[PDB]
Amino acid sequence: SKTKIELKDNWYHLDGEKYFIKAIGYEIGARPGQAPYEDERKDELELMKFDLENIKEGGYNTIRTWSQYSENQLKLVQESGLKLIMGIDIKPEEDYGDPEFVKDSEIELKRVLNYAKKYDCIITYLVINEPQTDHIHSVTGKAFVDLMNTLINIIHKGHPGIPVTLSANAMISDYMDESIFDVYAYNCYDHNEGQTATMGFKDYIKGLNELNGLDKPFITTAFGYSVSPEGGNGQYGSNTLKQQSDGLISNYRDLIDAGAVGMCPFYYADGWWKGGEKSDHSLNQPEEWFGFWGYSDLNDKYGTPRPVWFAMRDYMKGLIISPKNKSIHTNTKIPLELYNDKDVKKVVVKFRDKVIYSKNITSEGYMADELTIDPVGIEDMELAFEFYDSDNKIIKNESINILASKTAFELPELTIEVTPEKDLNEGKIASIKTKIETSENFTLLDDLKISYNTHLGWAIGSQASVSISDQLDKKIITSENFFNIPDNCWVVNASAGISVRYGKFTFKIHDQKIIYRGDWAKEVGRKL
C-alpha cells in the first residue's frame, strides 16, 4: 500500500496530490569531533530522533542526505513522517570507467535498494554529488554518462517508481545534460559573481531550466550562506547571522521564481569536519558554518538554532509558486499557485491597499486559482500577499512584484555574440560583443557586467564592469570585451547582463553562451 509518485506538469505528485518538497539538507554523524566519511559507521539513532523532531518543528516535510542510510536509520525516518531524498556515496573523484569502481558501486547500490525499497518515505534518489568539470573531461563524458545510466537503471528496477537525479552545482555543471535523469536538479548559490552577477540568481537558474526544456520537475538540492567568523570571498563565508537569514529567504523566493517545485536549503547544522579538522571549529573555513544550527563547543552534541531557522519556519507556512516575483504579464488573468501548510485558513492579495483576491482555505497543500488585475499601460505592481490563521491573524506577508499590461509590449533586450562562437580550439583569445536595444521608460542601472567563466574547478574566471554612461541616450548600446582562453578550458559559460528599472520593478537583461573546446562533451553536454 505504498505511495504512488507521478511526475507531470513539472510537479511531483504523491497519491494524486501536487506536493511541494519542503526539504532541508541533513547530515547525521557530523557532530563536533565526528567525520561521517572517516569514522567507524554508527547509526546514531538517539541524535537522529532529536534532529528529526527538530526538523518537523522547523516546518520541513522532507530531509535530503548525501550518504545512504542503514535500514535502522531509514525505519526511523519512515516512522517520523518526513520524506527522504537519499544520496548515494558514489565518490566523485574516482574513475567512473574503472570496472572495479563500477562493480563496487553497483554491489553497494543493490545492497541499499534491497531493504530501502520497503520504505516509501523515499521520494528521490541522488546518484552522485558534485562531479567536477575537469575530472569528467579527464575520465571522459562517456564514462560518466555510462555510469549514471547503470545506476539509474539499477534504481528503476530495484526500487520502482522512485525518481532519480543528481547533486550538481549550477555554477560548474550548467553545461551538463540532465535529460537521462527523472528530475532536473542543481545546487544553487547566489554570490553575485560570474553567472549570478550577469543574469541574477533567478534568471540564471531559470535559464538552465529553459535549456533543460521545461519537461520535468526541477528541484534545488542545496542553497544558503555560511556565517564563518572570516575566510571565503565576497558572500562565500563571513556572513552575519542576519545576512544568513535574509539570504536564505531571498534564495527561496528566487528559486521558486526559477520553476523549482522542491527545495533543499543547505542545511541543518554545522559540520566541523568539513574544513579539515573535526575537533576544531576553524574561524576561517566557510564550510564549517553553513548550519541553521550551531554547536557551542566540542562537547555540545545538540546545538541551538540561529535566526535563519525561525525565518525559514515562518516563510514556509505559505508558499507562493505563481505569480512569480519579477514576472512579466500581458493578460488581465494571472495564474495563482499556492502551497499552504495546515495553519493557513485565508489568503488575501492586495494592490495599493485594495483587496483584489480573498479566499478561505479549507484544505492544506496545493491550490490553483486566478488573479484579476487591471494594469494601465505598462504598470509595475507590488502584489501584497497576506496569510491568516484560524483566528484571522496574519502569520505571513510576502510581496510579488510584477510588470503588467493588457497588451504585448517591448522590453529592452541584451544579446551577445561570442568568439570563438562554437569551438574554443579555433583561437587562444576570446571576445564578447554585447548589444543592448534600449527602450525609453526603462532605465539601465549601473554597470554592464561581463563573465567568461572558464570552469577551472571552482574559479569564476574573468569578469568586467563596463560603464555605459557615455552611451545612455543611444537606441543601440554596444561593448566589446576580450578574454584569454586557458588551454585547459574545456567549456565556458560566456554571459553579460545589466540591471533595468521600470517604476519600482528592477530586473536584469542578459544573454548566455555555453561553448565547448572540442567534441569532448558529445555525450555529457546538453543537447538542445
Ligand X SMILES: OC[C@H]1O[C@@H](O[C@@H]2[C@@H](O)[C@H](O[C@@H]3[C@@H](O)[C@H](O)O[C@H](CO)[C@H]3O)O[C@H](CO)[C@H]2O)[C@H](O)[C@@H](O)[C@@H]1O
CB under 6 A: which stretch of 86-94, 333-341, 359-367, 413-421 binds ligand X? 86-94
294 grid coordinates: 550551531
| Shortest Å distance, C-beta 188 to ligand X | 8
434 grid coordinates: 554585447
Q: Give the Cα separation of 389 and 396 in Å (integer).
A: 9
Contact 92, 67 (CB under 8 A): no
| Shortest Å distance, C-beta 130 to ligand X | 5
Phi, psi (degrees; rounded to nearest 5) at 230: -155, -165
Nearer to ligand BGC, 118 or 135 (CB): 135
| Shortest Å distance, C-beta 63 to ligand X | 12
Contact 185, 126 (CB under 8 A): yes
Cα 125 to Cα 154, 163, 314, 348: the distances in Å are 11, 6, 28, 37
Query: Cell numbers 545538540 label which residue?
Result: 302
Q: Give the Cα separation of 424 and 485 in Å (integer).
A: 8
Residue type, 28: I
Nearer to ligand X, 257 or 288 (CB): 288
Nearer to ligand BGC, 223 or 505 (CB): 223
| Shortest Å distance, C-beta 236 to ligand BGC | 5
360-398: burial string, b at 16+ Cβ within 10 Å, e else: ebeeeebbeeebebebeebbebebbbbbbeeeeeebbeb
Query: Cell numbers 567534441 label which residue?
Result: 519
| Shortest Å distance, C-beta 171 to ligand X | 10
**Interface mask toward ligand X for 117-146; x: CB under 6 A:** ------------xx----------------
Nearer to ligand BGC, 17 or 230 (CB): 230
CB under 6 A: which stretch of 3-11, 88-96, 101-109, 346-354 binds ligand X? 88-96
SS3 408: coil
**Which does residue 141 bind out of ligand BGC, ligand X, none, counting CB within 5 to 8 angstroms by kind?**
none
Residue 300's CB is within 10 A of a number of other CB atoms, namely: 12
Using CB positions, name the residue nearest to ligand BGC.
Answer: 458
| Shortest Å distance, C-beta 89 to ligand X | 4
| Shortest Å distance, C-beta 87 to ligand X | 5
Using CB positions, name the residue nearest to ligand X.
Answer: 187
Nearer to ligand BGC, 396 or 455 (CB): 455
Nearer to ligand X, 202 or 278 (CB): 278
Sheet holding 365-372, edge to edge: 318-322, 333-340, 365-372
Distance of CA 123 to the CA centre of its chain: 18
Nearer to ligand X, 301 or 346 (CB): 301
Of 495, 10, 7, 490, which is closest to residue 204 (Cα–Cα)?
495
Q: Give the Cα separation of 314 and 287 in Å (integer).
A: 26
| Shortest Å distance, C-beta 310 to ligand BGC | 25
Q: Interface with ligand BGC by CB under 6 A: which residues?
A: 189, 191, 236, 458
Beta-carbon contacts of 241 under 8 Å, excluding residues fewer than 6 positions away, are 227, 306, 307, 308
Binding residue (CB under 6 A) for ligand X from 34, 54, 133, 169: 169
| Shortest Å distance, C-beta 528 to ligand X | 26
Nearer to ligand X, 166 or 430 (CB): 166
**Which does residue 200 bind out of ligand X, ligand BGC, none, counting CB within 5 to 8 angstroms by kind?**
none
Does residue 511 interact with ligand X by CB under 6 A? no
Element (H, E) at 145: helix 141-158
Strands (E), 277-411: 293-294, 304-305, 318-322, 327-329, 333-340, 346-351, 354-360, 365-372, 379-388, 394-404
| Shortest Å distance, C-beta 288 to ligand BGC | 12
Does residue 44 interact with ligand X by CB under 6 A? no
CB under 6 A: which stretch of 48-56, 83-91, 201-209, 356-364 binds ligand X? 83-91
Under rule CB under 6 A, which residues in 254-273 are in contact with ligand X?
Answer: 266, 271
**Which does residue 290 bind out of ligand X, ligand BGC, none, counting CB within 5 to 8 angstroms by kind?**
ligand X
Does residue 51 interact with ligand X by CB under 6 A? no
| Shortest Å distance, C-beta 254 to ligand BGC | 16
Under rule CB under 6 A, which residues in 474-503 are in contact with ligand X?
Answer: none
Cα 506 to Cα 18, 326, 331, 438, 443: the distances in Å are 31, 8, 20, 15, 9
Binding residue (CB under 6 A) for ligand X from 11, 12, 60, 66: 66
What is the binding site for ligand X (CB under 6 A)? 27, 30, 37, 66-67, 87, 89, 91-92, 129-130, 167, 169, 187, 222, 266, 271, 274, 287, 290
